[PDB]
Amino acid sequence: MQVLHVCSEMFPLLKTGGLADVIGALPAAQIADGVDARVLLPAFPDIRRGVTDAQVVSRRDTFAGHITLLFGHYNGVGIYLIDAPHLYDRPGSPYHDTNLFAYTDNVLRFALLGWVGAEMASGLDPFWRPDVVHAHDWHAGLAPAYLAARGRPAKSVFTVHNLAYQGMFYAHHMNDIQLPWSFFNIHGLEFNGQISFLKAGLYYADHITAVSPTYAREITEPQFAYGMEGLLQQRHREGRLSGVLNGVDEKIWSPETDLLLASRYTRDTLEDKAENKRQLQIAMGLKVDDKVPLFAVVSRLTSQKGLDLVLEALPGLLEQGGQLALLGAGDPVLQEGFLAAAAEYPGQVGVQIGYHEAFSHRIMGGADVILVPSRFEPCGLTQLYGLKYGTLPLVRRTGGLADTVSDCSLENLADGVASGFVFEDSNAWSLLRAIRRAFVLWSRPSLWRFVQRQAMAMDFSWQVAAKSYRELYYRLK
Ligand SMILES: Nc1ncnc2c1ncn2[C@@H]1O[C@H](COP(=O)(O)OP(=O)(O)O)[C@@H](O)[C@H]1O
Ligand SMILES: O=S(=O)(O)C[C@H](O)CN1CCN(CCO)CC1
Ligand SMILES: OC[C@H]1OC[C@H](O)[C@@H](O)[C@@H]1O
């Protein structure tokens, strides 16, 4: 079984979100479970410089110009690079320049990634050819379309990490990307008058996966599918739609082992987490106080995440004795909003705007509650990290969050399954009730500790996940 993941990020080389963490870990898991997984990424500079044993495999002209295909290893997995510097040799984001605008040639940049992914099914590498091309999100969405145009020399799976990003390009571009003009159709890649790379993935793949069981269902609803629910419902009935929950990488997210933390700790020695708390309080500039719950946020700041509700509920949170530590980047309305909040309530709100990998560890390791109050959430790795760090997650019952967190309800406490806090509707009031709940639990320290241990007993394993994908790759044959 040979699989090629086609995608545009991979931790630790280049990461803008959860996709990178999946790509950084799933292939190794799959290899453990007896699938020969390789990864194909565009040669962005950070990726290129991480893969130091990369040799030339071949060299092609292409509708977007010349690529030289490289192959190397990284962390014991086979990595293919699309080396096309006129497209990819640009600093910073895969997706947009330094003043946050999509590169005007994105349509070529990502069509090519899709294209190379499909060429591998046909022998671009004379020595290795995948049986399944596994494509991730809109960036790799044309790969199944290129594969359909060639008569499907390999079976394809497209997995949606997030339905909200649709990869829309002007229809004329049908002219620049080398696909049959016939593919521009509602039964194909056309979507609301433009080209959709997402639609191309959803339509042309042999099978579609979402990154959690409940999100696989939610995307058959209009509330989450944004116009695609028609395709998704059909594809559901055909048995071509499923969810496979993400794992977490234990090499990099485990308090037992985590070298970025002031102090390491375990499910049985939670006393050792205290010190991470003091240090976080200091670093953020909060009153150093162990008698008080410290809530935390680590996320992209965009409407998806519900953070404006956190903002809205903060007075109520502070009024009960709580602290807030925030680390995140995006919506300047939110950035500014949160910065304002920290100014107004110094010593009880700390806020670092920006992206800092290592500091998210120091937060995960130090806080009592991580807040993930998403409007929608295909998986959400941060609450999985909070579970593992025994920092209890406070989430909205949607997507992966619904799949992975159990509320402190009396049944749940009694069955020994409660692992955090869940609220139901997208508004400050509904969130504030979960906040109150956490204040109540906090005043029953035994119970808090009991829930902490259950949180830290949940297991999110990539090798378990691999097995599900393996089953899929065999069903498609
Ligand atoms: N400001 C930040 N600094 C460091 N890491 C961040 C920041 N924002 C998000 N992350 C990380 O990115 C990942 C977020 O992935 P996830 O929870 O799946 O949501 P999404 O894929 O929608 O970003 C987590 O590993 C989280 O720690
Ligand atoms: O914003 S763009 O449409 O131009 C590009 C990407 O969708 C940015 N991402 C990568 C995938 N994401 C969701 C899963 O990690 C975060 C947004
Ligand atoms: O696929 C992993 C991550 O990627 C995309 C989603 O936005 C997020 O919920 C998920 O955790």
Look up tokens 């309800």; give the residue: 409
How is residue 135 annotated by DSSP?
E
Other C-beta atoms closer than 10 Å to the C-beta of 93 total: 14
Q: How far is CA 355 from CA 97, 103, 352, 383, 415, in A?
A: 17, 21, 9, 18, 39
Residue count of the chain, please give it: 477
Cis peptide leading into residue 12 (ω within 30°): yes
- Helices in 9-84 by DSSP H: which ranges? 18-32, 45-50
Q: Is 211 in the pocket of ligand 3 (CB under 6 A)?
A: yes
Q: Please give the resolution of this entry in Å, rounded to 1 decimal.
A: 2.8
Distance CA 445, CA 293 (A): 11
Which atom, in ligand 1's list, is nearest to the CA of 384?
A: 17
Angle between helices 197-204 and 106-120 (to 10 degrees): 20
Six-digit token pair at 316? 């109520």
Domain spanning 249-458 has what CATH number?
3.40.50.2000
Q: 3-class SS at 469? A: helix
Residue 382 CA: nearest ligand 1 atom is: 17
Binding site membership of 439 for ligand 2 (Cβ less than 6 Å): no
Q: 219: Cβ below 6 Å to ligand 3?
A: no
Best probe residue, ligand 1, of 8, 360, 374, 376 (max atoms within 8 Å of C-beta): 360
Asked if 33 and 25 touch (Cβ cutoff 8 Å), the reply is no
Q: Is 305 annotated as a binding residue?
A: no
Q: State the amino acid at position 72 in one-letter form.
A: G
Domain 1-248+459-477 has CATH 3.40.50.2000: yes
For the record, the structure tokens of 160 come out as: 């949606």
In Å, the largest CA–CA distance within the chain is 67
The Cα 182–Cα 284 span in angstroms is 57
Q: Cite the residue boundaries of each domain of the chain with CATH code 3.40.50.2000.
A: 1-248+459-477, 249-458
Read out DSSP for 273-319?
Answer: GHHHHHHHHHHHTB---SSS-EEEEEEEESGGGTHHHHHHHHHHHHH
Question: In three state form, how does the secondary structure of 176-218 look?
Answer: CCCCCHHHCCCCCCEECCEEEHHHHHHHHCCEEEECCHHHHHH
* Ligand 3 near 465 CB (within 6 A): no
